[PDB]
Amino acid sequence: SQDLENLYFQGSMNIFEMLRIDEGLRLKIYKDTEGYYTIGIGHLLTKSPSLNAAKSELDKAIGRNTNGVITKDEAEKLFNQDVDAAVRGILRNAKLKPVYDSLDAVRRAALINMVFQMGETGVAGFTNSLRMLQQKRWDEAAVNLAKSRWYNQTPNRTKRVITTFRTGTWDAYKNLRKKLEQLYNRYKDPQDENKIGIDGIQQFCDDLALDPASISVLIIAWKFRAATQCEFSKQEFMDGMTELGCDSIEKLKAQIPKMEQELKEPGRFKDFYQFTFNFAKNPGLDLEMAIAYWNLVLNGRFKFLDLWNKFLLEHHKRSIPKDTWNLLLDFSTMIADDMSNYDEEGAWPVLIDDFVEFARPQIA
Numbered sequence: 001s002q003d004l005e006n007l008y009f010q011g012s013m014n015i016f017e018m019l020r021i022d023e024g025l026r027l028k029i030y031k032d033t034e035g036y037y038t039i040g041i042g043h044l045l046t047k048s049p050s051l052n053a054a055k056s057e058l059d060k061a062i063g064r065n066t067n068g069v070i071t072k073d074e075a076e077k078l079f080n081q082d083v084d085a086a087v088r089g090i091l092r093n094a095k096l097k098p099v100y101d102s103l104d105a106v107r108r109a110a111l112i113n114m115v116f117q118m119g120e121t122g123v124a125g126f127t128n129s130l131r132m133l134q135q136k137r138w139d140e141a142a143v144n145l146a147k148s149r150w151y152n153q154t155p156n157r158t159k160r161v162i163t164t165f166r167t168g169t170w171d172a173y174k175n176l177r178k179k180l181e182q183l184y185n186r187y188k189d190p191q192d193e194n195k196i197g198i199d200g201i202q203q204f205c206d207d208l209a210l211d212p213a214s215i216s217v218l219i220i221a222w223k224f225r226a227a228t229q230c231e232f233s234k235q236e237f238m239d240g241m242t243e244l245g246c247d248s249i250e251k252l253k254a255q256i257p258k259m260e261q262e263l264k265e266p267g268r269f270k271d272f273y274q275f276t277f278n279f280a281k282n283p284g285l286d287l288e289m290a291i292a293y294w295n296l297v298l299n300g301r302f303k304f305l306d307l308w309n310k311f312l313l314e315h316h317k318r319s320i321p322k323d324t325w326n327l328l329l330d331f332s333t334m335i336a337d338d339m340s341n342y343d344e345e346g347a348w349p350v351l352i353d354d355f356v357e358f359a360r361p362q363i364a
């Protein structure tokens with residue numbers, strides 16, 4: 001019924017794939033800018049602050065125990081309900097219905113795209129452009145659309161949607177995809193088409209003029225939501241580049257400072273810092289790998305980083321578990337210069353309790 005097999009008569013390119021590119025696709029529950037649990041393409045799950053509530057809503061919708069993770073197809077099914085609702089709203093809108101009806105399927109998708117971005121009221125203010133679309137005056141419509149604040153706000157997306165109105169083709173999307181594919185092919189593993197391996201990751205850093213071992217590259221992996229350090233999947237590369245709005249190394253190079261500035265927000269750094277643990281280990285974290293990554297991410301934040309290094313080098317080798325990783329940031333953020341405000345009854349890991357004692361000689 002909601003079976004995507006019901007849509008197999010359509011084109012492979014569709015409004016879903018369009019918005020997957022223009023708005024992005026998350027396959028795991030995340031919080032939106034307003035802090036609400038969301039999944040797929042901007043599908044609100046609940047306003048409830050409870051993640052379990054979010055997951056129950058998702059299971060109701062998907063029809064299985066999702067654990068808050070869905071497939072792309074499932075995301076499309078959620079999205080398809082959203083689209084149907086949006087289209088019904090278009091059809092209720094005196095200002096949009098005529099244009100919508102007049103349009104072919106590809107251009108409807110462009111219109112639906114505009115409604116998703118800016119809402120019916122937003123789209124309905126494009127009175128002239130809409131009229132031109134209605135009149136099949138595509139070039140004029142295209143020109144007029146480009147004069148707008150919309151275009152200024154999101155030029156990459158807007159130019160794609162406008163190209164869609166202008167041509168009635170998916171050419172903007174096919175072109176973007178092709179460009180990323182040709183880019184990707186520069187880095188893909190010769191023996192596994194669907195990932196970038198060690199050599200490709202080097203080449204990628206080389207093209208970015210980055211030390212493979214620098215924090216910038218970790219920050220990029222974080223933005224690309226990469227799963228693990230040893231490889232870089234096609235999906236991660238494509239979703240990353242699309243999400244960051246980059247179709248070139250040139251463009252991605254430019255984004256890196258912007259990712260750094262994002263890390264100035266403590267919540268965002270927390271996300272990054274905790275991401276790092278997951279990314280670093282093999283599917284706890286090897287102490288040597290932990291130290292390496294700690295030296296990268298805590299440099300300049302953790303006032304006791306050098307001591308921490310010394311402490312861990314003298315301390316008998318042991319795996320680092322997630323909560324130990326996680327809490328070190330809390331420590332680092334909390335702790336006074338002389339550690340005088342340390343709470344030995346704050347349930348810190350034993351490693352951090354140990355560290356505080358070990359650090360007393362340097363403190364004094």
Ligand SMILES: O=C(Nc1cccc(C(F)(F)F)c1)NC1CCN(Cc2ccccc2)CC1
Pocket residue numbers: 201204212213214217218219220221222224226227228229230231232233289292293296
């Ligand atoms: O970045 C790595 N893989 C990777 C995976 C997915 C996406 C991306 C990218 F960011 F490009 F999108 C990169 N592997 C590291 C690079 C540094 N060394 C040494 C190192 C350096 C510093 C601390 C610890 C280890 C380990 C392997």
